[PDB]
């Protein structure tokens, strides 16, 4: 992982990239159907645990130092670039796997992330990875109103309310992660004080109007509150949240030959 | 025709192997295939937006502008 | 799209003999194949029921010894091959009737040919 | 280092093995511009040993 | 309110010393003593205190400030009594013996972690035996024994929470003294399944962190173990060296101190040294001592500074071991840059015994051939790091015994990588050495001198030339030896003529132009060489046409150093 | 002018600075520039959202008053109803409003204008 994150990012013999390894790791985590046959002549969970502990200890090892010359002046730019590369890689490699194996870490790992966020409450990748873990936990349905579970509940509600009151003062590429996290909370904890989340989701969809991924994740989160909450407190802010949804509603080789079409052997906004 | 160096050095295959060149050709075809893949992945988004009026810069607005500047948008 | 008109014409293109009708049939089938060869997300859905009605038509009408129908038979078998290869496993409702039609085709009077 | 190699080669078959003669000639002949006194001692030991080996059976 | 009044008490005790504590004594009860100890032991045992943020993150150290301030205060007696009331290590001794492993109970694990944190804060407050007096001895051996029993019955496993709880209990044991021999005995357990090795592979970080405090007592204990103990002593010294290299933020003299001890504390146990150990033991010991050498500076024990002659002579002997494989011998060679004639002569005789005749007789894929290529590449790395002059001469001698028989492109690449390295006077010493050993011999200059010259420095070239001016001038005046010497001289002067216009060169123009004047291919090579020399004299003079027709990188580097390969 | 897009804003801020510099002119110094400046205040001082709009308009009004003081003769602007004193009353009222958005808008506007007010004597 150090070698993978060590590769820099440049945007507008061949130099390789970092995105190629995603299928490798997906196979590593989902090759049970053939490692059983190899065993003939569980452990995937064990390597998952090893990966989790390695990535957490390594990210907590890395320094996060910036300078004054508002002005964002990182003091260790190479380390920060490695950090953003690894955080993007981890947020894209977790979705295809199930956090049933991640279940032991849902308290301690998240606690460490909360500590790191409290250290530097200006890291977008922090909120990216927090959103990843929280959607994993809601996917595995970890929230059920265990002292560890109650501690997770309290941690999550505290972090959510503080980042909700702080995101109003953040800037682009940063508050976007915050609102992505906010919409990515499970409904039960954010059953309380919708007054904070309403402007958050309003500006979330406002940004989604020019940047789709925010828009559909807000859609999913929205339909989630619609399904999973009582309507009593649902009514009051509908007259506020629905009018903003007026956006998005202003819109306006091969031949007769038979060769089995090997071109076809392989595999937005309207959505 | 001042570029005859390229045409004279273009096909000095003689000190090379045939099927090695074939493997090179098909490998190049493969890299072109994934280059097309990433190109169409990039093209998935909307086409680049083009303006229809040249904009000057100053501290005071410039009313003296052609009628095209308003009719074309 | 135009495939409705085309299926109507093909169902209307086997009234008389005049094996030039079969030539119109094969050319037509070429056009519907290439039209539905590369749908985006939508035309496949209509193409499925178009295949349903066309298999119905060739089972109930294109059931004779005329070679103008035989060439249609081979070309549409190849055509359905490439569609189902492209469409994957999404033609589950039509599978058993396709099997019935195909078994009938084997037991068809073409068994002498 | 190939000294023991052709030693066992002429021990296993005990043919005429003039290839061994060529090999020892090669070993000796690598002496034109730089002195090789340790290699020189190795060379003389090898040629002596093959001398008694030749005395031994037939050659 | 709780934290603010607590820090207020800290300020009252510190800013106003015990001559002013009478104002607090006027309160006459100090009843906060019976809530603060619960606060330290458990936030739930006090007012809510939840929030898990910087306030209770910084609660422990300001609390430790409070405990120190009261430790100066005369209240410390009653405070220690209350601490004993809340915890006496006897109310918790059974609670750590409930087999917490598995998902059976977690509140027991939670309270054990809480008391671990409380007493480690007491250690930060300097309260170990004044508050928890030890046994008749000066230790609490039960903790390590119960850890070993738990890990034995864990498989006959653990959790991440169990792992950190074990680490906490380890540092609790580390809070007490005399644990070095205890942990040595624990790791020397030969219980097979061993088990001490399992414990080490579990908690190497904590073990090495503790033994960093130890300086020589650990070294002595591993010495007495080393009579027959081989694998685990190698492992523990590996942990020592890895942690010493890792610790840089404070200093790195810990590695130097431990290296000095172990060099002074090796000679009484040399069962690794010479033929008394298995071969695998020999590569293990040479690799670990190589790591030791790369830890300390080269100047440290490059001459007689202590046990340097003994370890140096052992280096010589182990490299002189004929039974030692040539590849492992080269692996041991690879740490030469930390280094008189004896080593050079034993090396030359060994490499003569190692490379009989070029590389053609060693076919590709032959194990001897692959060992040879590994050897040459590792000498290339060694000379790149060392630029040893006589060793460069040896490399040239073995190099220039047949053209293209060997990977000469690697050699010239190394020549480029070394010519810009080192002191200019040192490089000039290399040049004069390789020039003297030159007196077919043409191969020397052909394969090395042009490369080194084109990658040399200007001043070094100037001083080397000014050394060899007359030494070439005389040379300008069977005969094949003369021809070859002339070949070398013409080529070197032709190579160096691209720098700058003594100024006695007014005749060298004719002296090199005389090639085509006279009328077996040796002479053709002669004329070509001298005409090239003419080219080099012409290209610089007489413009007219008259010519008489990081953090992650640091971590990766530390990982590679632990590997020892790159 | 504070929208989240590259080319749009990249031409918007030139327009807003251009118009600001035009409305600063003393020939038309009164009766319509007041509306522009009060809107450029109330946008960012009074909003529950888009703090980017708040800081953008604070920078805008800082530049506006800077352009006015450097360009326009003083006696004209203090004899004009609009001057720095009207801004003083606006900020002083703005800090005491119960709404937190108004107070934080006042704070950020003052943070913008301090760098030029400190040079004032």
Curated annotation (Swiss-Prot), chain D:
It comes from the Eukaryota. Coiled coil: none annotated. Induction: In osteoblasts, by FGF2. ADP-ribosylated by PARP3. Phosphorylated on serine residues. Phosphorylation by PRKDC may enhance helicase activity. It is found in: Nucleus; Nucleus, Nucleolus; Chromosome. Single-stranded DNA-dependent ATP-dependent helicase that plays a key role in DNA non-homologous end joining (NHEJ) by recruiting DNA-PK to DNA. Required for double-strand break repair and V(D)J recombination. Also has a role in chromosome translocation. The DNA helicase II complex binds preferentially to fork-like ends of double-stranded DNA in a cell cycle-dependent manner. It works in the 3'-5' direction. During NHEJ, the XRCC5-XRRC6 dimer performs the recognition step: it recognizes and binds to the broken ends of the DNA and protects them from further resection. Belongs to the ku80 family. Individuals with systemic lupus erythematosus (SLE) and related disorders produce extremely large amounts of autoantibodies to XRCC6 and XRCC5. The EEXXXDDL motif is required for the interaction with catalytic subunit PRKDC and its recruitment to sites of DNA damage. This is X-ray repair cross-complementing protein 5. The chain holds residues 593 to 651 of 732 of the full protein.
UniProtKB/Swiss-Prot annotation, chain E:
It is found in: Nucleus; Nucleus, Nucleolus; Cytoplasm, Cytosol. Autophosphorylated at two clusters, the T2609 cluster and the S2056 cluster. Autophosphorylation induces a conformational change that leads to remodeling of the DNA-PK complex, requisite for efficient end processing and DNA repair. The gene is PRKDC. Signal peptide: none annotated. The lineage of its organism: Eukaryota, Metazoa, Chordata, Craniata, Vertebrata. DNA-PK is a heterotrimer of PRKDC and the Ku dimer (composed of XRCC6/Ku70 and XRCC5/Ku86). Formation of this complex may be promoted by interaction with ILF3. Component of the core long-range non-homologous end joining (NHEJ) complex (also named DNA-PK complex) composed of PRKDC, LIG4, XRCC4, XRCC6/Ku70, XRCC5/Ku86 and NHEJ1/XLF. Additional component of the NHEJ complex includes PAXX. Following autophosphorylation, PRKDC dissociates from DNA. Interacts with DNA-PKcs-interacting protein (KIP) with the region upstream the kinase domain. It comes from Homo sapiens. This is DNA-dependent protein kinase catalytic subunit. It is linked to Immunodeficiency 26 with or without neurologic abnormalities: A form of severe combined immunodeficiency characterized by reduced or absent T and B cells, recurrent candidiasis, and lower respiratory tract infections. Some patients show dysmorphic features, severe growth failure, microcephaly, seizures, and impaired neurological functions. Serine/threonine-protein kinase that acts as a molecular sensor for DNA damage. Involved in DNA non-homologous end joining (NHEJ) required for double-strand break (DSB) repair and V(D)J recombination. Must be bound to DNA to express its catalytic properties. Promotes processing of hairpin DNA structures in V(D)J recombination by activation of the hairpin endonuclease artemis (DCLRE1C). Recruited by XRCC5 and XRCC6 to DNA ends and is required to (1) protect and align broken ends of DNA, thereby preventing their degradation, (2) and sequester the DSB for repair by NHEJ. The chain holds residues 1337 to 2050 of 4128 of the full protein. Belongs to the PI3/PI4-kinase family. Changing residue 111 to M: In a lung squamous cell carcinoma sample; somatic mutation. Residues 158-193 are annotated as: Interaction with C1D.
């Amino acid at each position: 992982l150090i070698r993978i994150c060590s590769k820099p990012v440049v945007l507008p013999w061949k130099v390789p990239t970092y995105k190629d390894y995603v299928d490798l790791f997906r196979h590593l985590l989902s090759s049970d159907q053939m490692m059983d046959s190899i065993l003939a002549d569980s452990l995937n969970h064990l390597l998952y645990d090893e990966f989790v502990k390695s990535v957490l200890k390594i990210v907590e090892k890395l320094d996060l130092t910036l300078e004054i010359q508002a002005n964002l002046h990182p003091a260790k730019p190479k380390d920060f670039s490695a950090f953003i590369n690894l955080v993007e890689f981890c947020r894209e490699i977790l979705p295809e796997k199930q956090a049933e194996f991640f279940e032991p870490w849902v308290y301690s790992f998240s606690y460490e992330l909360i500590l790191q966020s409290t250290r530097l409450p200006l890291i977008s990748g922090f909120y990216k990875l927090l959103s990843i873990t929280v959607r994993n936990a809601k996917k595995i349905k970890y929230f059920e109103g265990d002292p560890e579970k109650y501690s997770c509940f309290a941690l999550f509600v505290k972090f959510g309310k503080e980042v909700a009151v702080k995101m109003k003062q953040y800037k682009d590429e940063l508050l976007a992660s915050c609102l992505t996290f906010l919409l990515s909370l499970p409904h039960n904890i954010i059953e309380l004080d919708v007054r904070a989340y309403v402007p958050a989701l309003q500006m979330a969809f406002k940004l989604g109007l020019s940047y789709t991924p925010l828009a559909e994740v807000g859609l999913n989160a929205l339909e989630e509150w619609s399904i999973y909450i009582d309507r009593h407190v649902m009514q009051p802010y509908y007259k506020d949240i629905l009018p903003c949804l007026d956006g998005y509603l202003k819109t306006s080789f091969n031949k007769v030959v038979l060769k089995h079409l090997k071109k076809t052997k392989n595999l937005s906004l309207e959505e | 025709g001042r570029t005859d160096l390229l045409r004279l050095r273009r096909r000095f295959m003689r000190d090379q192997e045939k099927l090695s060149l074939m493997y090179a050709r098909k490998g190049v075809a493969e890299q072109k295939r994934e280059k097309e893949i990433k190109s169409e992945l990039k093209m998935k988004q909307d086409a680049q937006v083009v303006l229809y009026r040249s904009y000057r810069h100053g501290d005071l607005p410039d009313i003296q502008i052609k009628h095209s500047s308003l009719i074309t948008p | 799209c135009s495939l409705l008109r085309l299926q109507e014409t093909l169902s209307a293109a086997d009234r008389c003999g005049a094996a030039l009708a079969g030539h119109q049939l094969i050319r037509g089938l070429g056009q519907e194949c290439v039209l539905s060869s590369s749908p985006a997300v939508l035309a496949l859905q209509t193409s499925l029921v178009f295949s349903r009605d066309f298999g119905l038509l060739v089972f109930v009408r294109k059931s004779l010894n005329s070679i103008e129908f035989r060439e249609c038979r081979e070309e549409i078998l190849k055509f359905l091959c490439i569609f189902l290869e492209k469409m994957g496993q999404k033609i589950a409702p039509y599978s058993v009737e396709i099997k019935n039609t195909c078994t009938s085709v084997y037991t068809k009077d073409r068994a002498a040919k | 280092n190939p000294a023991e190699n052709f030693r066992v080669l002429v021990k296993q078959k005990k043919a005429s093995f003039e290839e061994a003669s060529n090999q020892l000639i090669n070993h000796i002949e690598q002496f034109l511009d730089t002195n090789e006194t340790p290699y020189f001692m190795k060379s003389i030991d090898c040629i002596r040993a093959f001398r008694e080996e030749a005395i031994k059976f037939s050659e | 309110v709780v934290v603010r009044i607590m820090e207020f008490t800290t300020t009252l005790l510190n800013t106003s010393p015990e001559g002013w504590k009478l104002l607090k004594k006027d309160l006459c009860n100090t009843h906060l003593m019976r809530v603060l100890v619960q606060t330290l032991c458990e936030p739930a045992s006090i007012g809510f205190n939840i929030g898990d943020v910087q306030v209770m993150a910084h609660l422990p150290d300001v609390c430790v400030n409070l405990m120190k301030a009261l430790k100066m205060s005369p209240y410390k007696d009653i405070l220690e009594t209350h601490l004993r009331e809340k915890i006496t290590a006897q109310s918790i001794e059974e609670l750590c013996a409930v087999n917490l492993y598995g998902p059976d109970a977690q509140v027991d694990r939670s309270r054990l972690a809480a008391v671990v944190s409380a007493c480690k804060q007491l250690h930060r407050a300097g309260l170990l035996h004044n508050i928890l007096p030890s046994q008749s001895t000066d230790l609490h051996h039960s903790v390590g024994t119960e850890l070993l029993s738990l890990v034995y019955k864990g498989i006959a496993s653990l959790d991440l929470s169990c792992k950190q709880l074990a680490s906490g209990l380890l540092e609790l044991a580390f809070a007490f003294g005399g644990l070095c021999e205890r942990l040595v005995s624990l790791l020397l357990n030969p219980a097979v399944l061993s088990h001490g090795e399992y414990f080490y592979s579990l908690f190497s970080e904590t073990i090495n962190t503790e033994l960093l405090k130890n300086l020589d007592l650990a070294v002595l204990e591993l010495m007495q173990s080393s009579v027959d103990n081989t694998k685990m002593v190698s492992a523990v010294l590996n942990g020592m060296l890895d942690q010493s290299f890792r610790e840089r933020a404070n200093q790195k003299h810990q590695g130097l101190k431990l290296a000095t001890t172990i060099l002074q504390h090796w000679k009484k146990c040399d069962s690794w040294w010479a033929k008394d150990s298995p071969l695998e033991t020999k590569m293990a010991v040479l690799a670990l001592l190589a790591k030791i050498l790369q830890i300390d500076s080269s100047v440290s024990f490059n001459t007689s500074h202590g046990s340097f002659p003994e370890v140096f002579t052992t280096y010589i002997s182990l490299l002189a071991d004929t039974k030692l494989d040539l590849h492992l011998k080269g692996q041991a060679v690879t740490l030469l840059p930390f280094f008189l004639e004896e080593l050079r002569r034993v090396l030359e005789q060994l490499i003569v015994a190692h490379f009989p005749m070029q590389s053609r007789e060693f076919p590709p894929g032959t194990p001897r051939f692959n060992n040879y290529v590994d050897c040459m590449k590792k000498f290339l790395d060694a000379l790149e790091l060392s630029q040893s002059p006589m060793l460069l001469e040896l490399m040239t001698e073995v190099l220039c015994r047949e053209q293209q028989h060997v990977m000469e492109e690697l050699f010239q690449s190394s020549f480029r990588r070394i010519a810009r390295r080192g002191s200019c006077v040192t490089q000039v010493g290399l040049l004069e050495s390789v020039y003297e050993m030159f007196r077919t011999r043409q191969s020397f200059v052909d394969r090395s001198l042009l490369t080194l010259l084109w990658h040399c420095s200007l001043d070094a070239l100037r001083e080397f030339f000014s050394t060899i001016v007359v030494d070439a001038i005389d040379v300008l005046k069977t005969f094949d030896t003369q021809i070859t010497k002339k070949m070398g001289y013409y080529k070197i002067l032709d190579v160096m003529y691209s720098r700058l216009p003594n100024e006695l060169t007014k005749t060298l123009i004719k002296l090199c132009y005389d090639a085509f004047t006279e009328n077996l291919e040796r002479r053709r090579l002669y004329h070509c060489a001298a005409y090239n020399c003419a080219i080099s004299v012409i290209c610089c003079v007489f413009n007219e046409l008259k010519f008489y027709q990081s953090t992650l990188s640091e971590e990766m580097s530390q990982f590679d150093f632990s590997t020892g390969v790159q | 002018a504070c929208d989240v897009d590259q080319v749009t804003r990249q031409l918007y801020e030139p327009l807003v600075m251009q118009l600001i510099h035009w409305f600063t002119n003393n020939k038309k110094f009164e009766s319509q520039d007041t509306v522009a400046l009060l809107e450029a205040i109330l946008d960012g001082i009074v909003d529950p959202v888009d703090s980017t709009l708040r800081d953008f308009c604070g920078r805008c009004i800082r530049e506006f008053l800077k352009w006015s003081i450097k360009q326009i003769t003083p006696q004209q602007q203090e004899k004009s109803p609009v001057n720095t004193k009207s801004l003083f009353k606006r900020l002083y009222s703005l800090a005491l409003h119960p709404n937190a958005f108004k107070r934080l808008g006042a704070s950020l506007a003052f943070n913008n204008i301090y760098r030029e007010f400190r040079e004032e004597e």
